[PDB]
Each structure stands twice: as C-alpha cells, then as structure tokens.
A paper describes a structure:
The solved structure for [name] [name]-4 (2.51 Å) includes four molecules in the asymmetric unit, each starting from Pro 213 and continuing to Asp 422 (numbering corresponds to the processed [name] protein). Root-mean-square-deviation (RMSD) among these four molecules is <2.4 Å. The [name]-4 repeats from both structures superpose well (RMSD 2.1 Å), and good quality electron density maps allowed us to unambiguously position side chains for most residues. The final model for [name] [name]-4 is missing residues 243–246 in chain A, and residues 244–248 in chain B (chains C and D are complete). [name] [name]-4 was refolded by overnight dialysis against 20 mM TrisHCl [pH 7.5], 150 mM NaCl, 400 mM arginine, 2 mM CaCl2, 2 mM DTT using MWCO 2000 membranes. Crystals were grown by vapor diffusion at 4°C by mixing equal volumes of protein ([name] [name]-4 = 14.4 mg/ml and [name] EC1-4 = 7.7 mg/ml) and reservoir solution ([name] [name]-4 contained 100 mM calcium acetate, 100 mM sodium cacodylate [pH 6.1], 25% MPD; [name] EC1-4 contained 200 mM sodium chloride, 100 mM TrisHCl [pH 8.1], 8% PEG 20,000). Although the [name] [name]-4 structure does not reveal any relevant interface, the [name] EC1-4 structure does. The [name] [name]-4 N317S fragment refolded well as assessed by size exclusion chromatography (SEC), but its melting temperature is considerably lower (40.7 ± 0.6°C vs. 52.4 ± 0.3°C), even in the presence of 2 mM CaCl2. Another [name]-FE mutation of a surface residue (E313K, equivalent to E290K) did not show a dramatic shift in melting temperature (50.4 ± 0.1°C). These SEC and thermal stability results indicate that the [name]-4 fragment carrying the N317S mutation is folded, and may bind calcium, yet it is not as stable as the wild-type fragment.
Author numbering: 213 to 242, 248 to 423
C-alpha cells in the first residue's frame, strides 16, 4: 500500500460531536489491508480519535478542547495481512479550531477578592486596586473589554493588559461608607460572552 498523500492536515471544530468525520484515508484500491495508528505524539491523542481498521476512516472519539491542546499529530500505517509485507505510513495533523466557549474571568489585584479598603483623604487619581480580565480562548474570542457599572466616585482606567480602579470623586466616610461596585466584561467572539463581578469597597479615614 501507499497513502495518497504522505501528510494530511484537517481542521476540526473543538467540541465536535463524537463520531464526527475527520478523514477517510486510502492506501490501496479496487480488501485485506489493515489501517491502524502506530504512534500518537501526545498520549492524549489516543483517547481523542479512533480509526476503522478496514476503511481507514478516522473519527472523533473523545472531547476535543482547544484550550487543552491545539494540534494533534497522528502516525497512521497500512499493512496487508501478509507473511512478509512492509507497511505504508502517513502523518495526519489535526488542527483543533478554537470557538468561544469561555467567558471572561475578572480578577481583582488585592490581598482579598472583596476585602478592599481606602481612605477618604485619597485624591483624584489614587489607584485603590488593579483589575485583570482574562479569557482562555484565542484571537478575538479571547480579547476582552470592560467597564464599571452604576455611577459612583470611582472609575476604571484602560491600559494594555490591565485596568486600574481609581477614585473619581470627593469621598467622605460620613456621606458614604460602603460601596458595591460591579464590573461588566465582554469578549469579542461570536456570540460574545460576558461576565460580571460585584465587589465591595469599604471606605476609611485611616
Ligand atoms: Ca478509505
Ligand atoms: Ca474549549
Ligand atoms: Ca475555545
Ligand atoms: Ca471568550
């Protein structure tokens, strides 16, 4: 036998259903030849794909997760039931294509994820905390954007790779003691997924 091509590359959606076709291989024609995997660069690759020993059809066999692994290399052979008979080999590269299956995570940089205080004497601009928003997806699906909600005497400041929670108002512990702030976040995949974190700011005099 001889595979039509030496190397094949196929795209497959992440989260593809079990039994999704990946590729139908061919190393003969008009059969007694036996298609099999002989190697699996990652050992994870072994649960993700099955192949029909008779037709050489590879199908999805477990849950394909882009965030777990992007790209699979499989080595396939074809061998006739034969007393003496050499195998044909090919490589099958499976690109697992990322979809937006991950909402944005919103992280506060403080020593606690709500316990977060300030002094009313802090001026216009005092960075009280740092927020980091992440998304495990790639590309647009993973580009995130966020925004403080309600209106309140703070504001977020937009940097590449992080945001800073400032004061934007005269504070005094007497007029307003606690606050409840909400951060809303949205990624740029389709459909856009979105996430939000509500967290407390307690004010002090010192
Ligand atoms: Ca075939
Ligand atoms: Ca995933
Ligand atoms: Ca994804
Ligand atoms: Ca996402």
């Amino acid at each position: 036998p001889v595979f039509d091509e030496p190397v094949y590359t196929v795209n497959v959606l992440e989260n593809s259903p079990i039994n999704t076709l990946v590729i139908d291989l061919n190393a003969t024609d008009p059969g007694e030849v036996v298609y099999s995997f002989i190697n699996f660069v990652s050992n994870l690759t072994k649960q993700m794909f099955k192949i029909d020993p008779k037709t050489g059809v590879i199908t999805v066999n477990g849950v394909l997760d882009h965030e777990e692994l992007h790209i699979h290399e499989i080595d396939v052979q074809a061998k006739d039931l034969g007393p003496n008979s050499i195998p044909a080999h090919c490589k099958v590269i499976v690109n697992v294509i990322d979809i937006n299956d991950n909402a944005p995570e919103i992280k506060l940089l403080s020593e606690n994820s709500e316990m977060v205080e300030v002094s009313e004497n802090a001026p216009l601009g005092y960075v009280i905390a740092l927020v980091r928003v992440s998304d495990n997806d790639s590309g647009a699906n993973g580009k995130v954007q966020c925004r403080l909600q309600g209106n309140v005497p703070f504001r977020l400041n937009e940097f590449e790779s992080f945001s800073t929670l400032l004061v934007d108002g005269r504070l005094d512990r007497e007029q307003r003691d606690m606050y409840n702030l909400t951060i809303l976040a949205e990624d740029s995949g389709y459909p856009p997924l979105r996430s939000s974190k509500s967290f407390a700011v307690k004010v002090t005099d010192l």
